[model samples]
Target: SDDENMEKIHVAARKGQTDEVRRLIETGVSPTIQNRFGCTALHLACKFGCVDTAKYLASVGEVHSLWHGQKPIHLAVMANKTDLVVALVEGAKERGQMPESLLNECDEREVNEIGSHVKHCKGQTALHWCVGLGPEYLEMIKILVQLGASPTAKDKADETPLMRAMEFRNREALDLMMDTVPSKSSLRLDYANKQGNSHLHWAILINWEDVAMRFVEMGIDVNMEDNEHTVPLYLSVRAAMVLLTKELLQKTDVFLIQACPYHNGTTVLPDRVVWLDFVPAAADPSKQEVLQLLQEKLDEVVRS
Candidate 1:
């Protein structure tokens, strides 16, 4: 069974027993056997920075092209093994053995269901993983983007990697990601998450004023709301003192209100009230009252 083989190989790889692994490979043990975690021996080696073991494993034809969820290339990149990456890519290319799928443009929406436990959201792809967790693999990111990784790929929640980087306060990673893929010009600005909260929301929640300012500089919509229709200002006010909240509020230019049409059953009004009308009340009242007011104002704005 693949699981059985995986257990054996994992033990060998973890123990750095290259000779045993080679013997098993010779005995027809699958070089690509995946353990319960979908990790191949190469993954174990790479995760531990066992470069010699990984190199040896990769030299075997059966092991070189194997992929668990992320390919050996992904593991090598994540391990920051530049030499391993070069070796793998060049070797595969020379033998015309590179996975056909890898040669194709990286699809931002293609889910790695096998090796990934991440659920299907909007449409997160392998590229998201590279950007989100592949900071050590800048070269790999570059390679992926050059191979057509979509910078604008939105997940099920419509959040992009750039947005995630900003939300997580991964400044260095963000900088490197942006540098690697300059095409993310539009995405460079702070954008809303599934909750409609911009990077400002996260910054405020975490009390990261500098990060909040960075979002403001990037023109994030401060009034962005979550599914509950609560905006960033509301979050800031609830999470901090009025003075601090007000100070942060002054950094943005987002209009507190916007007019939109309302339709009720058989009636449609061309003149609509602004959405910002509810924002102030949403931020100023007691929790219960704030909630009630938000619903009332939301209805009023939509009905106007």
Candidate 2:
């Protein structure tokens, strides 16, 4: 009698049947039945995107199982069940005790490096699953990041979520990653204050876009220095990789100062009509094309 009841619960959970699952459990059926895969009813509900039922099962059961190789979070992510993924992250700690072996396990052979690179993750953590072959899961990343998945956790080959986006050149993924952090710019922007790097800085550092046009719309704090006195305009210019301009004019805003002593000994190298020098045109280009772009923004103020 009990064996059949447990089988029904597993089937019901796999099919997303909340009512049947609840009835069976209320009738004393166990939620932890493990099959060859080592997956329990909780795993099935999450794997299939059965949220209401999965939520219930998660409440009553543990997420990690010893029977199979994947963690419940990892399976839900692979399934692309966004809501269920969020649900699991919320309850990841409710059931189960942790053994040290569980923490460092990486089952499944590492034959899919390319797939992992394309998919954005194969298993290190639930965060790895947010990326995939096409749509890029912009909204899904937002939810997962919001729910507290590890953004820096790396998969077996040591690829991190951000690295996945970068290596793939998934600009949308990167843009959303920045936008998703609303404050220390809200992780909504209040949270942004705690962070120092902005995607705009990374984009400029990598020459992803021209500093001139790139500045108009990103809507960032010109003064939000990443490293000591390293604003994008100054950072771009100082790095001596002038692809943007000798028109690289001058400080557009106030805080674009130089902390590095090499800048003519002034705390603020604020200029209105300066560009790169002693660099590119080999001996006399403005060296800072993007710097000049923002400097031009400041130049406009006097003209206005």
Candidate 3:
């Protein structure tokens, strides 16, 4: 039976044994034969970082197929295999396939079992994979963008690569995205995730003051609210991010309610001295500073 040969080719290719893979193909094992997971030998080669074997398989095998909804390129990006990624993209172009055809392909919807709970992580492009791994995968991020991977591609969660970078506080990835995304176009900067948290909202939530400041300096909407109706000014103050709170105070509505629901009633930012119950007394000065800023804004309202 050719059954064992099918299994053997994948094992050999994943191990980087080009000779064994060739022998299998020469001995009548179909190079295009997909194993149980729908992965050809080429997919295994790319996923395992077996560069030579991947190249050989790509040369001799049908390189296009999805493994558990992952293309070979998605696997390579997940594994941080930069060369295999480039080779696959370039190889596709050489074959007269538009590189964006592969670059923008998102992973399909598939359910995972976790104790009677089902989770589906669908619609993730290779660029989303790079940002998820943070700045360490900078090379993959750079190359993917350079090769036409859509930086604005949204995942199942309605998150773009730049949004994920903000959530992770990955400055390197953020820097690349800022420089690479169109300077005049405001589309990427305007996107919010499913929770209505914009990039600036995430930047402040993570206490990335410099990043939040940069977003403010770029003139992102200071008044944008999350699902809970909490504005960035409230977020910065709630976390005692002194510098960000001060900056937001200059732009955000002082009288606007950034509401957080409480057991008895809703709490607004102006009435609440946030972080006092959860944070230590050492943060008192910062808390008082924000309280003072809010008072100043309220006074300005009266003067008008």
Candidate 4:
């Protein structure tokens, strides 16, 4: 009979029957009871998008327990239940925890693997999950940001939420993250990953010309070098991003110290390009155009 009662509670919660959920819990069913999947009634309500039921369950039941090492907020985010997410955070605060206690909590599983290989990817906050879902879940991301989720929280791979957004080329989400990061925050637009590639470098490598240009327009660090001492401009030119190259040349000098073989750091632009082995592609005029731009920059430097 107890097992049957537990089943009834889970079923009622899943069906969005708040009255039945309340009645069952009041009549002696433990609100913290976990179903076969380790999900509580609140988990079911949040996962199924039952805002009122989720709110009530969160108020009366456990809001902080791991549904397989994920909080109810994680489920709400994965389900795109924006209001339920807000309600869960509010309920957690009412129970005497800081907003960050729930808002910035990490999911234990490695969500980076994405498809079937997800395992112990640690240190990712709710913002990481929200951004990984891209602009489609922009409202959830906005709520998370408004509620104080850290833009600089790095996962096991040293990947921030903004990096995930750029990796997906989620332009709107990328802009939201860029806007949310405080003006005084260094991590706002310049965080790099394990490869030492900032969002700008990653955008260039992925050939997302639009995103690359946006970062340039926003005044990101053009000269920030990666693990190979390669800067965004170098990658832009080599990748044949002509428009990006033109914009970068305005801010980037060919004579700037780069991954040069010279100990004096005086390797000039043409030599630097040659050292990096960037052969001009005849099939694509864009690569040739990039070289010509670099030549012009060289000429201007010499004349000055």
Q: Could you tell me the lDDT of residue 237 within candidate 4?
A: 74
Best by lDDT: 4
Provide the overall lDDT of each model, using Cα atoms, as 2-decimal numbers: 0.54, 0.54, 0.70, 0.71
In candidate 4, stretches whose alpha carbon ends up further than 4 angstroms from where it belongs are 1-65, 93-101, 111-123, 130-153, 169-187, 252-280, 302-304
Evaluate residue 167 in candidate 3 and report its C-alpha lDDT on the 0 to 100 scale. Answer: 56
What is residue 244's positional error in candidate 2, in angstroms? 12
* Candidate 4 residue lDDT tens string, 217-297: 777888788898877777877777789988887887455623333222322443344322343434557756777776666
Off by over 4 Å in 2: 1-5, 66-68, 86-122, 182-239, 242-304
The 10-residue segment of model 4 with minimum total lDDT is 258-267
lDDT of 2: 0.54
What order do you get sorting by TM-score, best first?
A: 4, 3, 2, 1
Index of the highest-TM-score prediction: 4
How do all models score by TM-score?
A: 0.41, 0.55, 0.64, 0.66
Q: Write the per-residue lDDT of candidate 2 for residues 39-64, one digit (tens) a residue.
A: 68887786678888876776676644
Q: What are the C-alpha RMSDs, in order, of all predicted structures?
A: 10.8, 8.6, 6.7, 5.5
Lowest-sum lDDT 10-residue window in model 3: 259-268
Which scores higher on TM-score, 1 or 2? 2
User: What is candidate 3's local distance difference test score?
Assistant: 0.70
Q: Is candidate 2 or candidate 4 better by lDDT?
A: 4
